[PDB]
Design a protein around this motif. Structure first.
Motif, PDB file in Angstrom:
ATOM      1  N   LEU A  80       0.841  -1.218   0.000  1.00 28.74           N
ATOM      2  CA  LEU A  80       0.000   0.000   0.000  1.00 28.74           C
ATOM      3  C   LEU A  80       0.878   1.272   0.000  1.00 28.74           C
ATOM      4  O   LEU A  80       0.582   2.189  -0.742  1.00 28.74           O
ATOM      5  CB  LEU A  80      -0.938   0.031   1.196  1.00 28.74           C
ATOM      6  CG  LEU A  80      -1.821   1.270   1.370  1.00 28.74           C
ATOM      7  CD1 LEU A  80      -2.746   1.467   0.131  1.00 28.74           C
ATOM      8  CD2 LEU A  80      -2.619   1.070   2.653  1.00 28.74           C
ATOM      9  N   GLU A  81       1.904   1.322   0.860  1.00 30.74           N
ATOM     10  CA  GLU A  81       2.821   2.494   0.940  1.00 30.74           C
ATOM     11  C   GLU A  81       3.393   2.809  -0.436  1.00 30.74           C
ATOM     12  O   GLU A  81       3.433   3.995  -0.886  1.00 30.74           O
ATOM     13  CB  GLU A  81       3.968   2.192   1.921  1.00 30.74           C
ATOM     14  CG  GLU A  81       5.273   3.091   1.809  1.00 30.74           C
ATOM     15  CD  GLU A  81       5.044   4.586   1.979  1.00 30.74           C
ATOM     16  OE1 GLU A  81       5.889   5.397   1.501  1.00 30.74           O
ATOM     17  OE2 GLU A  81       4.036   4.979   2.611  1.00 30.74           O
ATOM     18  N   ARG A  82       3.820   1.755  -1.123  1.00 28.30           N
ATOM     19  CA  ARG A  82       4.533   1.910  -2.395  1.00 28.30           C
ATOM     20  C   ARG A  82       3.576   2.286  -3.531  1.00 28.30           C
ATOM     21  O   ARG A  82       3.943   3.051  -4.456  1.00 28.30           O
ATOM     22  CB  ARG A  82       5.365   0.645  -2.674  1.00 28.30           C
ATOM     23  CG  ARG A  82       6.550   0.491  -1.620  1.00 28.30           C
ATOM     24  CD  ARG A  82       7.662   1.542  -1.899  1.00 28.30           C
ATOM     25  NE  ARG A  82       8.371   1.212  -3.136  1.00 28.30           N
ATOM     26  CZ  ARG A  82       9.427   1.851  -3.635  1.00 28.30           C
ATOM     27  NH1 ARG A  82       9.962   2.904  -2.996  1.00 28.30           N
ATOM     28  NH2 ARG A  82       9.946   1.428  -4.806  1.00 28.30           N
ATOM     29  N   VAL A  83       2.346   1.772  -3.468  1.00 34.11           N
ATOM     30  CA  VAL A  83       1.310   2.168  -4.432  1.00 34.11           C
ATOM     31  C   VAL A  83       1.004   3.643  -4.233  1.00 34.11           C
ATOM     32  O   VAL A  83       0.984   4.388  -5.197  1.00 34.11           O
ATOM     33  CB  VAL A  83       0.030   1.303  -4.296  1.00 34.11           C
ATOM     34  CG1 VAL A  83      -1.118   1.872  -5.161  1.00 34.11           C
ATOM     35  CG2 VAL A  83       0.333  -0.114  -4.764  1.00 34.11           C
ATOM     36  N   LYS A  84       0.816   4.071  -2.978  1.00 32.15           N
ATOM     37  CA  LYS A  84       0.542   5.489  -2.747  1.00 32.15           C
ATOM     38  C   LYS A  84       1.715   6.353  -3.243  1.00 32.15           C
ATOM     39  O   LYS A  84       1.498   7.434  -3.747  1.00 32.15           O
ATOM     40  CB  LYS A  84       0.335   5.753  -1.285  1.00 32.15           C
ATOM     41  CG  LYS A  84      -0.904   5.100  -0.668  1.00 32.15           C
ATOM     42  CD  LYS A  84      -0.873   5.600   0.777  1.00 32.15           C
ATOM     43  CE  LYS A  84      -1.982   5.095   1.619  1.00 32.15           C
ATOM     44  NZ  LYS A  84      -1.746   5.698   2.967  1.00 32.15           N
ATOM     45  N   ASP A  85       2.954   5.876  -3.069  1.00 33.25           N
ATOM     46  CA  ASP A  85       4.142   6.565  -3.622  1.00 33.25           C
ATOM     47  C   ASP A  85       4.031   6.853  -5.112  1.00 33.25           C
ATOM     48  O   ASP A  85       4.339   7.988  -5.583  1.00 33.25           O
ATOM     49  CB  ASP A  85       5.420   5.743  -3.373  1.00 33.25           C
ATOM     50  CG  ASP A  85       5.881   5.795  -1.958  1.00 33.25           C
ATOM     51  OD1 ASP A  85       5.463   6.691  -1.164  1.00 33.25           O
ATOM     52  OD2 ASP A  85       6.697   4.934  -1.621  1.00 33.25           O
ATOM     53  N   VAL A  86       3.629   5.838  -5.881  1.00 31.60           N
ATOM     54  CA  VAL A  86       3.462   6.018  -7.352  1.00 31.60           C
ATOM     55  C   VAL A  86       2.343   7.007  -7.619  1.00 31.60           C
ATOM     56  O   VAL A  86       2.465   7.875  -8.501  1.00 31.60           O
ATOM     57  CB  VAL A  86       3.119   4.702  -8.060  1.00 31.60           C
ATOM     58  CG1 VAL A  86       2.778   4.932  -9.539  1.00 31.60           C
ATOM     59  CG2 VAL A  86       4.249   3.694  -7.876  1.00 31.60           C
ATOM     60  N   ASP A 124      -1.288  15.657  -2.404  1.00 30.55           N
ATOM     61  CA  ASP A 124      -0.947  15.497  -0.965  1.00 30.55           C
ATOM     62  C   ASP A 124      -1.156  14.030  -0.578  1.00 30.55           C
ATOM     63  O   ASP A 124      -2.247  13.515  -0.754  1.00 30.55           O
ATOM     64  CB  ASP A 124      -1.891  16.403  -0.138  1.00 30.55           C
ATOM     65  CG  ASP A 124      -1.419  16.615   1.306  1.00 30.55           C
ATOM     66  OD1 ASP A 124      -0.774  15.716   1.898  1.00 30.55           O
ATOM     67  OD2 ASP A 124      -1.737  17.694   1.873  1.00 30.55           O
ATOM     68  N   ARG A 125      -0.100  13.378  -0.082  1.00 29.96           N
ATOM     69  CA  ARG A 125      -0.103  11.974   0.329  1.00 29.96           C
ATOM     70  C   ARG A 125      -1.208  11.691   1.340  1.00 29.96           C
ATOM     71  O   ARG A 125      -1.837  10.616   1.326  1.00 29.96           O
ATOM     72  CB  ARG A 125       1.238  11.637   0.973  1.00 29.96           C
ATOM     73  CG  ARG A 125       1.522  10.175   1.003  1.00 29.96           C
ATOM     74  CD  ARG A 125       2.716   9.820   1.898  1.00 29.96           C
ATOM     75  NE  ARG A 125       2.802   8.368   1.939  1.00 29.96           N
ATOM     76  CZ  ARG A 125       3.186   7.637   0.899  1.00 29.96           C
ATOM     77  NH1 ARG A 125       3.556   8.228  -0.238  1.00 29.96           N
ATOM     78  NH2 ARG A 125       3.216   6.323   0.990  1.00 29.96           N
ATOM     79  N   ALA A 126      -1.451  12.673   2.213  1.00 31.98           N
ATOM     80  CA  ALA A 126      -2.532  12.593   3.182  1.00 31.98           C
ATOM     81  C   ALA A 126      -3.908  12.324   2.575  1.00 31.98           C
ATOM     82  O   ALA A 126      -4.771  11.748   3.238  1.00 31.98           O
ATOM     83  CB  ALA A 126      -2.557  13.841   4.066  1.00 31.98           C
TER      84      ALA A 126
HETATM   85 ZN   LIG Z   1       7.217   5.312   0.305  1.00 30.61          ZN
END
Ligand SMILES: [Zn+2]
Ligand code: NA
Ligand SMILES: [Zn+2]
Ligand SMILES: [Zn+2]
Ligand SMILES: [Zn+2]
Ligand SMILES: [Zn+2]
Length: 80
Positions: free
Chosen positions: A7-13, A21-23
């Motif tokens: 999930l972290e890495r998908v949100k990164d892309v 905004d990542r939030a």
């Molecule tokens: Zn990341």
């Protein structure tokens, strides 16, 4: 065993491609409805998932990648 790293890495892309905004990015985020992805944004985002995760997303599957969760689930299944 849990979906947190991917999930972290998908949100990164998503953040790198769309610049939002990542939030704001969560599993239920819909790229078109919530993040104003246009047709060009969407093709490029799909291609970025393919490159970033080493998966193939043909156009028939690409149309079904509507949300952050869809992308995560697709990648997880591709690597299984
Ligand atoms: Zn990341
Ligand atoms: Na096709
Ligand atoms: Zn980056
Ligand atoms: Zn392209
Ligand atoms: Zn879905
Ligand atoms: Zn999962």
């Amino acid at each position: 065993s849990d979906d947190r790293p991917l999930l972290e890495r998908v949100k990164d892309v998503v953040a790198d491609q769309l610049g939002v905004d990542r939030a704001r990015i969560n599993p239920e985020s819909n790229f078109i409805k919530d993040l104003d992805a246009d047709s060009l944004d969407s093709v490029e985002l799909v291609m970025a998932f393919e490159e970033k995760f080493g998966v193939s997303i043909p156009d028939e599957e690409a149309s079904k990648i509507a949300t952050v969760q869809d992308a995560l689930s697709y990648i997880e299944k591709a690597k299984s």
